[PDB]
Design a protein around this ligand. Sequence first.
Ligand code: ZN
Lengths: 98, 397, 397, 397, 397, 133
Amino acid sequence: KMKAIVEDFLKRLHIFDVARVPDDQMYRLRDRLRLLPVEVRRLDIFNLILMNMDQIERASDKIAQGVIIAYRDMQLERDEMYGYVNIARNLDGFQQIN
Amino acid sequence: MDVLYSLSKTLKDARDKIVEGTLYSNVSDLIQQFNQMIITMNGNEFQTGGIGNLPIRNWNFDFGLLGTTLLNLDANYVETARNTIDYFVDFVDNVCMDEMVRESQRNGIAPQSDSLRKLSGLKFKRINFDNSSEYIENWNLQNRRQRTGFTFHKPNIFPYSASFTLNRSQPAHDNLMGTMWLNAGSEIQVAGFDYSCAINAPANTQQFEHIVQLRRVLTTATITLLPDAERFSFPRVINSADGATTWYFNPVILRPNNVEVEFLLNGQIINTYQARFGTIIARNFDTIRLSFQLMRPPNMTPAVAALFPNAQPFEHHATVGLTLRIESAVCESVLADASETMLANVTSVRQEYAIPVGPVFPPGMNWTDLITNYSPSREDNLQRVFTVASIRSMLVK
Amino acid sequence: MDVLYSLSKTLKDARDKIVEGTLYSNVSDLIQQFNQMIITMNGNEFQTGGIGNLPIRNWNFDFGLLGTTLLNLDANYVETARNTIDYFVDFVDNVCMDEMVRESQRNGIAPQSDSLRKLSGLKFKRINFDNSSEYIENWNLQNRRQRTGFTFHKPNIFPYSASFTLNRSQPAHDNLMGTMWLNAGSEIQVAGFDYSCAINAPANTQQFEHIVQLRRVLTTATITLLPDAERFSFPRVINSADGATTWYFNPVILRPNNVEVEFLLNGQIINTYQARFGTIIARNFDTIRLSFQLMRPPNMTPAVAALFPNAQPFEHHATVGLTLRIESAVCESVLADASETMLANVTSVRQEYAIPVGPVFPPGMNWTDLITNYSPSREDNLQRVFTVASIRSMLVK
Amino acid sequence: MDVLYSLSKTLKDARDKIVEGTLYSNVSDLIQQFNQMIITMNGNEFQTGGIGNLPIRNWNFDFGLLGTTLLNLDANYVETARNTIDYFVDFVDNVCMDEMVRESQRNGIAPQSDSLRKLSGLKFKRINFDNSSEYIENWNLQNRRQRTGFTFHKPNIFPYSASFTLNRSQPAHDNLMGTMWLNAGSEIQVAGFDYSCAINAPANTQQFEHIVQLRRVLTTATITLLPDAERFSFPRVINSADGATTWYFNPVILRPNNVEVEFLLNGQIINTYQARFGTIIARNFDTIRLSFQLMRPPNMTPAVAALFPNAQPFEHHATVGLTLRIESAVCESVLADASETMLANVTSVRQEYAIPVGPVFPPGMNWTDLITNYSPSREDNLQRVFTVASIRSMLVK
Amino acid sequence: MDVLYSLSKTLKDARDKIVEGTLYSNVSDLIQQFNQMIITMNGNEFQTGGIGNLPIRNWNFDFGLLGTTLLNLDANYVETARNTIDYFVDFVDNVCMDEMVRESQRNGIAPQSDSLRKLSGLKFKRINFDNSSEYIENWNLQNRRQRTGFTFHKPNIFPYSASFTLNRSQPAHDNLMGTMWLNAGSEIQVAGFDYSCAINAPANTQQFEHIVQLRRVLTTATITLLPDAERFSFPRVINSADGATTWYFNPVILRPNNVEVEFLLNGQIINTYQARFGTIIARNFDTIRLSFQLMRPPNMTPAVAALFPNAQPFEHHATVGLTLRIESAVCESVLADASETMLANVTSVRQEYAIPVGPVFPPGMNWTDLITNYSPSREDNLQRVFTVASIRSMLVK
Amino acid sequence: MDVLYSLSKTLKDARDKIVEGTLYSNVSDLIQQFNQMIITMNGNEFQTGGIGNLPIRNWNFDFGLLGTTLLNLDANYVETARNTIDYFVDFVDNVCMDEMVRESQRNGIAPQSDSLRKLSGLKFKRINFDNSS
Ligand SMILES: [Zn+2]
């Protein structure tokens, strides 16, 4: 967030050989950048990705969001696509630990 | 609560800024906000109603977002949207109404309904925005602690009161002296009468006074003050104070002498006007005091002299009066006035659904009763209920 | 039509948000919308006028755009813009006015002028935006059709009517009984008089009643009801019903007894109030019925007894009355009221340009005549015409 | 000046669109504008107050900016902001008030205070925006030059005037003929009386006339005109023109005959109405002329005949009258009305801080005195002062 | 504000936990907090005073930190510290006092002084700490808006009132009946007297009643109720109601009959006690109603019979009474009581520095006047001012 | 019983020492104590009320511990905390009141309520502290 981006930035601008850039400069550079709008183009797309983000993640084949523990002989559910399985599209009623 | 607000300006600034055509970019900042909502919702079930003739409609959520793709909206885009809004409309209505009836003596200022108690929840606050609607603007500042303030017109500060006080009377009621008045809404009319036309009064002048104590302070009031009380300028047959008989009032009007209006705040004179009729400003007051006199005319043409004999019977009753009207004012507390529909909205929803009388509000939301005993609980409930009515009127009128 | 709207909030939210200073950002979402317009336009010839004293200015379109190559708007930017807006201003004026006169029986609810008939065209719909102006908000909801609605302070629902009805009379008009009233705007005053003071009436009580039928339903009405009709509390010489002679009315006022106000809807009582003076709510009604009585005072002091003899001549005429004022209300149909300038705008533009009387509206847009025979055609034309007046007032007052 | 405006819609559209939750995307175009300000500021020092009993608080600036990071506001973000706004609030107040008292004869239309004279500076202009507040919208248009305009309910155009004119009188005041009236605010009531009931008048008709000259032209006025002047329908004892004695007025009311109302502009009849009671439109006028007659009833029942003898004494005084009320109108000049708090705000701030009488405004900002001699200087100062009051009311009520 | 608090518990928990001896570790958590402060300060400049006989003093900062080194504390460590505290002490004093005098109508709640307005600043918030001081504990909860509360011994809820009401009297004042009382602080004494000893009264019993309306609700009140009013049990010569003469009261005391005390809240009986003397609990009330009777003794020994003849003169005046004292109670609003020095501190600082009367508080901070008209503004100012007095008393008594 | 006590000085010395401003370290010895509690709780369920006009509300637990974001607390830290305290407040009230009504001749000097009889339990004693009241 710091350097990383800045570095690439200047490089593509050609003109200067980074390195000899006082550290007070590169960061200060960010401080100014992080205060502007964003080419509708650019922006307009990110808004898009975020809205669908969730949907992709769970929609994948390898990987799912967390598991629950009941220590309560629990009844397995049935869903056409998987057969006799133990899913549950809704965690509500048990603490959540990020 | 603040939650609730958004839900609307959301829809209005929505059902309004979305029409077959408009170039997208007028809503980019809008579409977004919208979606955000849908998400937070979907998956949570809701319940409303459960009293009088208020249906118990149940609700559920599971809706697709809104393609933020296109550059110019095509009709097809609208319809697939309006159909999703019309569930929120018909919803909110059933939501407002539900919390627009329940009342609480203790914390009658906070949320009550099983619908709202769940809204103040934290996972929901991810919505608030554009609080420019005069009422919410004031709700916040109050929850935060500061000088609130609302704008009115012909405000409704005076509980209805129409009566008289006989300072001199006798069984025959043939030589009375006193005052009669009508305080109602934003107006006061008061007349001072002296059947004897101050014949035996010191300096041939009879002093009168009318004091009205407001239940709430009014600030920045624009007021019309005029001489004479037309309402008490005609012949009347009135019931006696004890209700046992009736007296006759046959007024003849003279100009009120030494008129002095004082607008007091906690006993202190804030504004005082001496015989100034027309438009006057009273900047901060909780009491109005009108003092005026009847002065027997020192010089009288025969026709006048004939009305005022040295001895009874007194057949023409000398009367002086004043009329005062508060055109506009600001109050830190919500009040009914001549322009806002809040009181009428709340009263109407309760009447339509046969809502039972509760522990806070007088039967029928009666204004006179309410303002006469305007307790803190009634005010907090009234403000909550008025703010909800205003949120509702942004979409449903 | 909806087209028209935009053309304005375009300019207002323009001539307002565009000034020497501000950061571009405030208008990015705005500038865009703007340009879009210019494009659609340029190249189309428009004609306005051709009736009465209405010029016929023709307009051509060939205008540049608005660079988006700046951050802070330099003065130079403004002027090169204001000069382009002032052609749209002076235009729209000439546009509104043109369609603010023509009337049509068949399809009065629709567009007329050679100016607008071309606007509803499809190739123009590419503009529409920010429909939050109370009136358009309501125009739309009316075409898909649903619970439309407006807000009015002291509305104008009662066509002027000032008359009387003698229930008991005789040639000499020396012992009459009946009612007299004034219905006008948002107010009703009615008095019941009985020259005999119910001397021979059952229970010494004379019943009175006044019914007023609204031409449109009013909902959420905040109403002031007060005893007495000041307008009918003074001596009068009145023309007889047949116009052949004049009678004398010499009132003496008593409190109205058993006052009952009913607000009915389709014959059903929606709200009823018994002797409640002050502020009352009538939530939905098309009729008001005021019933009140004159009850001869059972106990009278000598002065009172003297006014009411057992035999004629009856020289003091017992009178009871009521005053009712609708402070605010909501109506599904447009109406004139005490705050909005719509009626005055439409009437004024027609008068200024000597517009000939048409087939829909009464001469001079006379309110009483209009509301008395408020046909569907007059209402559709009135709404179209009021909505246009409101669009115009966003720019030209 | 325009500067000032922004400073507010900045804060309102701020203290309103910024709360625990909302997405950044509803404020990107906003945040920016904001910061821009901060910059221009801090570094510059200010002084406000002095005159009268008004504290002199000194203000320094140097506030860090914001974040464009979080795209979902966290409570912590708000508080660190509200704390920075509350310095601008408590500031602006002290700013408005300071320039809301200073008046200037010569060029008393521009800025006066050491606070504002520095604001009109150029280096500040970098802020101006969202000029949709009815008042600023009009301030600008006035700077460039164009048909300005405001909207008013029950406007306050008539300086208080309550008097009479005896066209026929004699020492005993037993056979008078003339008119009496009350012009105040937006209302006029006038009565014409003839003690002889036109017994010796040509055609047994007495003509009356009442002319009222407005100090400013009113356009698009919606007016209620009703027959009768209730205010002059009751018995009165009045002072003679020379103040040496008192006369008796004992009215009996007849319908005004041949009523004609003319709304004139520069001597020309713009609107004329013949006997039309109810709602009428006067589209542009600076003068109202009411003409009406008393016609002796050609046919009289005994009771009526008895009131009007062929010879004196004349004991019942024939009276005809009219009542005219301007419900709403537009004026190119600022005026007080029944809804706006501007006059009251200005008057209140001056009263609270014991501001000394200046060279422009009458003592106490007295409305009657102001409108009676509404000079260009008073109007320019009033507009400046009203516009500031409106800027202040966006944040402080 | 909360800022202010810390500044103290900082010093107390400092000037207290730091002396020749003790181990570092018992203050480690303390030292730290301290330093943190110094930093934030240094560089910043201040100003206090400038009102009445109040010295204006300027202060700057530039101080060393603390040896977080040493294990134990050597004398030398203390002195080099106390010398740095004594600047903060003598400072805070001059700070409290400065904001303990300024009053304000609008925002009478928030800060006023050029000293504090700078403290609420954000850059200083880096200092809050240990808020177990009953008063701050309550200040906070009031901002978040929630059920607050305080503890008071012999509270001061009753404005001084000492008077009487003659229900039966005559010029000679030789056969009176009525009540006399003293309401002051936390006590009420009321006596009912009947010169005739109910000789002609129904059931030979005279009913009495005394109602006292509190300006604020008291909850959890422990109350002592005793029969008899010693204050009204002795011979008196009293001024007549009109001040024109003096009457003689020569009481003889009888036990109050059918004693009933009601503690009401908004008209509802919350607690009721029938003839229960001693200690009673009133859990929530805004009104106290004491009803008691004088019953003529049905059986009398000669000595008693001699005091109560069948005919006047009535020389021994039968009297019954009650005494009620609120020992302790809780109030949601600050009040003066018999133990706390807040009122005295505020009143004393203002008196010592000759602070001019302001717009909020009555002259001399008069308690009776204050509690009689305990407006919201007076309460907010009183709470601010009481909280500051309590912060000051942690260091300066 | 002693249990009960803590639950409070816990909150007071909490709702008081926890404000938008103080350095962490002025509460290190405090934060700790706090958390310890949360743990012991979560899971076990409670009943209150069941008498006269006394509501019977059921209280269940499920809360995350407490951060530490160094160098004085940020507002955001407070709110996410106050929201967790206000459940304990509105709780304790309903707890005190429940055992503030039941009486018993024989052994009416000890706990009575189904709420407290469970508090004197051993698995809870792990809390007691600052007994200066
Ligand atoms: Zn009005």
